[model samples]
Target: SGRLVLRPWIRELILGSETPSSPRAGQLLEVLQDAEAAVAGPSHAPDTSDVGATLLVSDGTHSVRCLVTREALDTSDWEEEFGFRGTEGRLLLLQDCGVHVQVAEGGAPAEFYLQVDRFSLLPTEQPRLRVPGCNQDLDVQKKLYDCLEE
Candidate 1:
């Protein structure tokens, strides 16, 4: 067996806007030497696997399912499997909803939660995720599960 490799955050990469420069893809994943080393024991306990979680979050006005990993928070894919991504993709954590990233990063700000701003149907044909003020949205970081149509 091999030992799991813990990747350090890429230089200049931060949990920022979903761009080609997004730190999401910057980290290099290493094969796990031990399964136990890869599995996170518990939040109460201390274990490191870099595993992320998917969540169906809503702000009453709109909702979106997000795949949050140690690298990035994916919110562009609308597969109807996790929860919803149409109007949800438009929602950003602190920036879009009128909050600061630094504050949210401290302890998961309430603004990080969904909000009732505005909701509408996205173009199902070629639904593209828009990154509000940024040049691009968090589209490049799609998961394998996204390939499987629901």
Candidate 2:
């Protein structure tokens, strides 16, 4: 079941997308090699910066690089849950996560900078799939009847 899951969901995140704020999960691919910038302060920053600033995450098959905004972790809350380095190579379920699709230059830029108040390391892993060329199944009851009718 788990195999049928994340791949399809993340595919949707690319071709289409969910609402502004929702739960999504993915595998931590990297923090992006050069994907960090300060949020306009010399001190008292967003609290989880440098290593925790930006990310490249995947749903096994697909990946999205997003900035750390609220999918933005709170210091006390998640630091207690799994700690942050559980990042970079672990899987996590995100709450209030968002997708921002916009047009950039000639190409359509799908900016998935996202949020909620929380995220937690997968504690995880899908649905049944139809067999190819073999169609006598759940939604295809007619396939059995029609094929046999001959």
Candidate 3:
């Protein structure tokens, strides 16, 4: 018999794994982390000119600045590269030196320049599935039919 462990009901005390749960965790976390990261001065030295200020995006403890030329300020790549996009999607940008930055301030123009913290690939890897066309035994077929109910 399965253990009917009764902890605090999630609906009454904690949030569940639903997309549209009220008081969404992403919204709350974003607002909190952003507020904590945006300080008076930036955390890193930017390579761009002073056309604009470097806005550091931090998780309250560690921070990285997303500097732009004041021209690449309104880009999706930058926003996706930073964690600034207010959507619950994984955004990633890969750099040449193997530095990948999370898009924070998205919705900028197409020319927004981004800095590299580390290089990472967000590419989808096709699942290596061995479709056993002729590897199934008669017993395996019976087991599959039993589960399939067809």
Candidate 4:
């Protein structure tokens, strides 16, 4: 492998232990955790993890598992070139990101995360959820899904 330049859009995405940065200023989404993602355009004979990306997004105190829909990713596709080479990880932070307290099983405490159901304000300028590049994709943000695509 040569110099793998991770797209600015997907830079925040990683599966290893990393110090999560804020998608914005004064925000709480601290853990920009990723999942076991698959590759497309590269033609790798692997498993399925495409179409939708699941990310474990969280903060210092609370966190929740997030599922970014293909549409959502596609919506941000303008920033994300939907590339070939530098693609493997996924880090996420929802825009307008609403939340609700959930209950797992009986007596089980649930974690708090985002549910982008009520908004689509989007990211800002720096791109790929750096808290700044979202305003650019406001119109295209109207999109995406089930199976915890929250």
Candidate 5:
């Protein structure tokens, strides 16, 4: 007999999912792929003018590329709301895009890139550390019996 496998994994959450190519969807995928290979690193502080940059997202086990679209950064309260002096090893949640990015700069910010979109800071996703165990099945019937009757 075979037993079904059940577990919470990233592949189940992202596999076979289709992301619409909207305003920033294309760029979003590009950055995310870059992060997987350590190409896109941390980011620098926003320049005196435009606060544009791309950052990496990692879930402790896996990583992806991410960025804030220029449109979102253009908001009047962008800095006050999402600005951070540094983003090394920071965790961010991509809202509309339904994605996530974790900064991996070895305790420092990386170079800057021009891109910005909708995203919010979210807690980092830690990896599971429980050891695996074999699954078991039970098939038995129990009836009430008095020991004295024996």
Candidate 6:
């Protein structure tokens, strides 16, 4: 019902990189009117409802799952569910993310753990960042279908 023009690299990431066969801008759009009818119109009322959607970001080998608001989907940045932060030039596409903490009591075998709280492309510059997605889970179906199957 709706259409979106994803980013140029996004199209390549999803589809593939091909030589120019036609003039295509690095942009995507949505047919807003048709989408509204499909959801709000009589054809599909009960079946269509608004709900939170999850964003899955992967670097081929590892991926991070997070919840995203409809607003977040349209824009480049937004606040996260758990921590207070925003994106600094595609942090979601980051190869590695998390907070590296080192607690030294007496400088003898300090205990520490990796907690991925605030993430950024350049953590050394400002150290303050934001979240694009949230609630890192292993399975989407498990989170959505627990009651139905159980």
Q: Assess each prediction's global lDDT (C-alpha) against the native.
A: 0.27, 0.47, 0.27, 0.34, 0.34, 0.28
Worst 10 residues of 5 by lDDT: 135-144
User: How do the candidates rank by TM-score, highest first?
Assistant: 2, 5, 4, 6, 1, 3
Estimate, for each residue in 107-149, the C-alpha lDDT of model 5 and write its tens digit.
9432212233565553432333322211110110011012112
Q: Pick the candidate with the highest TM-score.
A: 2
Please provide TM-scores, in order, for all candidate models, with all chains considered together.
0.20, 0.49, 0.19, 0.31, 0.36, 0.22
- Residue-level lDDT of model 3, residues 14-112, one tens digit each, is 122222222211001112122112235555844333243233222212222334223333222432444333522222232221112232257631211
Whole-model lDDT, model 6:
0.28
Which residue pairs clash within candidate 2?
1-126, 2-126, 69-72, 96-115
Each model's backbone clash number: 2, 4, 23, 6, 14, 6
Q: Residue-wise lDDT of candidate 2 within 1-150, one digit each (tens)?
A: 353455325545433423634577776666553223335556754533344445666665555655555335534254343334435566677664555432235764223343334556664422112222112123333433433354
| Model 5: residue 106 alpha-carbon error in angstroms | 24
What digit string (tens of lDDT, one per residue) describes model 1 on residues 1-150?
985332322111223343222111111011122111244335676654444443343222222333344333233343344222233323233222211121235564212211212222233222233212110123312321232223
Candidate 1 versus truth, CA RMSD in Å, comes to 19.1
- In candidate 4, position 67 carries an lDDT of 47
Give candidate 1's error at residue 104 in angstroms.
33
**Candidate 5's error at 15, in angstroms?**
3.0
Give the TM-score comparing model 3 with the true structure, all chains together.
0.19
